[PDB]
């Protein structure tokens, strides 16, 4: 593919309240021979969740709230006296020159989301939400878990650069220590979480239908006992 030395992190929140979201920070292959493409080096891009096309990594870092490149390279690069990694990350900064502050970076992120829309503040909010609740949920979901996400993204880029320089071996999909085993417990939990969500949704619909109609509602009748029972039974019966 066009990407050489890609890197991923199938992040999943501790309680698995959401499906696993994958960030795919990767490095472009040396295939472009434009005016100033191959001379500087290789650009680094990140395929964030719920965004339909790649974003340069420095834009994501700036969106996380780090404008000055000193702060960026103090997260990606840990050792100052190491010219090779600095030279290899030069293209990433050179591509992100046009983006200069946090809010414009947020606009960059949000303009390529699910919907283009019309106004600015709405997709500034969209970019803030997708970087706060969908990019690396396992390190932070709270409102002010930005420094931790910045450090983790820096570590990801550092691993990418180390792999590119050859200082690490690329991982194996088979090193069986990289594989987890979903047993009956986690699998049944996966069904039960969604199906309890369905039950709560049904209770909400029923009780809303009664409250707007202008009367108290009996809790016992709101609960559809069919849902959990004949959902778990169906899943264990058919195997789907």
């Amino acid at each position: 593919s066009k990407y050489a030395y890609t890197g991923e992190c199938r992040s999943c929140l501790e309680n698995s309240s959401r499906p696993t979201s994958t960030i795919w920070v990767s490095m472009l292959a040396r295939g472009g021979q434009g005016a100033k493409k191959s001379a500087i080096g290789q650009r680094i891009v990140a395929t964030l969740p719920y965004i339909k096309q790649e974003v340069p990594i420095i834009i994501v870092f700036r969106a996380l709230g780090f404008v000055s490149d000193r702060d960026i390279l103090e997260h990606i690069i840990y050792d100052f006296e190491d010219p090779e990694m600095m030279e290899m990350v030069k293209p990433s900064l050179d591509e992100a020159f046009v983006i200069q502050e946090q809010n414009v970076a947020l606009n960059f992120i949000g303009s390529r989301g699910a919907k283009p829309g019309v106004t600015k503040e709405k997709r500034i909010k969209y970019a803030k939400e997708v970087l706060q609740k969908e990019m690396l949920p396992h390190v932070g979901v709270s409102d002010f878990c930005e420094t931790k996400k910045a450090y983790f993204l820096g570590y990801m880029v550092h691993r990418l650069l180390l792999a590119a320089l050859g200082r690490r071996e690329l991982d194996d999909r088979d090193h069986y220590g990289n594989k987890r085993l979903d047993l009956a417990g986690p699998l049944l939990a996966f069904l039960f979480r969604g199906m309890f969500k369905n039950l709560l949704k049904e209770v909400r619909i029923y009780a809303q239908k009664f409250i707007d109609r202008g009367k108290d509602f009996n809790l016992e009748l709101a609960i559809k006992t069919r849902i959990i029972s004949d959902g778990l039974k169906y899943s264990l019966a058919t195997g789907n």
Binding site: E14, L181, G185
Partner: protein, 193 residues
């Protein structure tokens, strides 16, 4: 058949045909962790001589070793071996660390990854200290009379003579194939089992 299937997956039991290799079977002593809460590990690490990410300048990360818990970068530590020895002691003593918690030190990269989530596959191994098994004749004598007693496997695990090793922690250990044939005194293949 990857190398890391040693002791976790049977090298022989697979179907032949369109599903060869993809369908496997657990080894006879393979154990899959049900997971645990990483909270007590985090409290212990914070109480220990570890410094959190927000309390450090970025310049200090290079020399220090990173600490990952369940894949989440928690902080950094300046003395890796002391922390590793303490953590291993706690796990072997059935302290706040559950026996199924995998604990890994990538020395060549200055990383300490502590995995606690469910789904990891691990197997029990005897513990070796200075070229000698920690499983003495006393343990075997107690195990022989399991009936009319209360000694059992859990007492071996609590005695610190057997511990569950994960397939990914298995990368950082030296296994002796058999005790009285690989730990004798000769032109030694390895003196740090």
């Amino acid at each position: 058949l990857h190398n890391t299937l040693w002791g976790m997956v049977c090298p022989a039991e697979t179907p032949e045909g369109h599903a060869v290799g993809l369908v496997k079977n657990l080894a006879l002593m393979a154990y899959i962790s049900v997971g645990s809460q990483p909270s007590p590990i985090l409290e212990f690490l914070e109480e220990w001589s570890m410094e959190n990410l927000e309390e450090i300048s970025p310049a200090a990360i290079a020399d220090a070793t990173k600490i990952f818990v369940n894949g989440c970068w928690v902080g950094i530590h300046k003395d890796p071996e002391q922390l590793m020895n303490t953590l291993r002691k706690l796990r072997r003593q059935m302290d706040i660390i559950v026996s199924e918690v995998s604990m890994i030190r990538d020395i060549r990269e200055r990383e300490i990854r502590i995995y606690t989530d469910a789904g990891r596959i691990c197997r029990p191994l005897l513990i070796v200290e200075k070229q000698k098994l920690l499983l003495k004749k006393r343990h075997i004598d107690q195990l022989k009379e399991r009936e009319y007693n209360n000694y059992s496997w859990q007492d071996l695990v609590a005695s610190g003579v057997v511990e569950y090793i994960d397939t990914l922690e298995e990368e950082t250990v030296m296994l002796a194939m058999t005790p009285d044939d690989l730990q004798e005194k000769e032109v030694a293949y390895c003196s740090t089992y």
